[PDB]
Amino acid sequence: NDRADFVVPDITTRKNVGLSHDANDFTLPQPLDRYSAEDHATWATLYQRQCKLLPGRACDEFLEGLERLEVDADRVPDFNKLNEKLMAATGWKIVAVPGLIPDDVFFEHLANRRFPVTWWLREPHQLDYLQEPDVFHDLFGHVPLLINPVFADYLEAYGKGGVKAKALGALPMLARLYWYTVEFGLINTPAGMRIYGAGILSSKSESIYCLDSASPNRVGFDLMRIMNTRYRIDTFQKTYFVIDSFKQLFDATAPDFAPLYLQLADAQPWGAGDIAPDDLVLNA
Numbered sequence: 001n002d003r004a005d006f007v008v009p010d011i012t013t014r015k016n017v018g019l020s021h022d023a024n025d026f027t028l029p030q031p032l033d034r035y036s037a038e039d040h041a042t043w044a045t046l047y048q049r050q051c052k053l054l055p056g057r058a059c060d061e062f063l064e065g066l067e068r069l070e071v072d073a074d075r076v077p078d079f080n081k082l083n084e085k086l087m088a089a090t091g092w093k094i095v096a097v098p099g100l101i102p103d104d105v106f107f108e109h110l111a112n113r114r115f116p117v118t119w120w121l122r123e124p125h126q127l128d129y130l131q132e133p134d135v136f137h138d139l140f141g142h143v144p145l146l147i148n149p150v151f152a153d154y155l156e157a158y159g160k161g162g163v164k165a166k167a168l169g170a171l172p173m174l175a176r177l178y179w180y181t182v183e184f185g186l187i188n189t190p191a192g193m194r195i196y197g198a199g200i201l202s203s204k205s206e207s208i209y210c211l212d213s214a215s216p217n218r219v220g221f222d223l224m225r226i227m228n229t230r231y232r233i234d235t236f237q238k239t240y241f242v243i244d245s246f247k248q249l250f251d252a253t254a255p256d257f258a259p260l261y262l263q264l265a266d267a268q269p270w271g272a273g274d275i276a277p278d279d280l281v282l283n284a
Contacts, residue, residue: 065144110159141198
């Protein structure tokens with residue numbers, strides 16, 4: 001709009017009217033009075049649809065975590081109550097945030113075993129991986145995996161490294177690492193390829209596509225390749241990275257990343273659909 005810019009408000013803005021958030025850490029008390037009977041039914045529908053698709057697809061740790069933490073199947077979970085179990089089982093807790101938050105705020109939470117969860121739920125007509133993460137993507141997609149202590153330690157170390165990053169170019173590199181592991185990672189298991197990425201596990205379409213399709217590349221995890229690989233947000237992934245164990249992912253954070261950012265700082269990144277000379281790729 002020329003000069004008098006009227007725009008479509010995003011869902012984050014509409015849902016948070018009248019609500020405040022901490023100026024420093026972006027947290028707020030979860031607004032339980034804001035979920036309508038309709039939102040509880042949307043949660044229940046999403047949860048049930050994913051639980052029929054996950055067998056043979058989600059890694060075993062994810063399934064066990066959903067069982068052990070008893071994530072509510074029938075309504076949006078009460079964060080405080082879930083935290084009673086999550087803290088005792090893993091040392092982590094979730095904190096409510098309004099929607100997207102600055103990277104530095106996000107790293108500081110992970111570094112301190114706090115996983116930020118957008119509190120609001122998508123509306124009825126927006127059932128598959130919309131614009132902006134919501135409570136189902138954030139809570140259902142990430143929280144169960146924290147039950148694996150190695151994956152929880154990976155996230156804590158990932159956060160600590162983000163807190164420390166200063167080199168220009170470090171942020172896009174860390175964003176690609178997070179996207180191709182925590183959001184869209186696959187893991188090879190004795191029983192076949194399985195999924196551990198939150199952006200996949202909370203999405204009906206991604207859950208099916210990542211293990212069924214011939215078009216995408218499935219490449220073995222390689223830290224430096226991933227930090228130098230672009231990703232697209234509004235379409236199915238063109239490459240998925242596969243780990244062999246959560247220990248391999250954790251061990252990847254062992255080195256201090258400072259020298260790695262400098263090494264990649266002037267590199268042209270790989271396209272999201274490219275295959276690099278040093279990749280090991282899934283056979284067929």
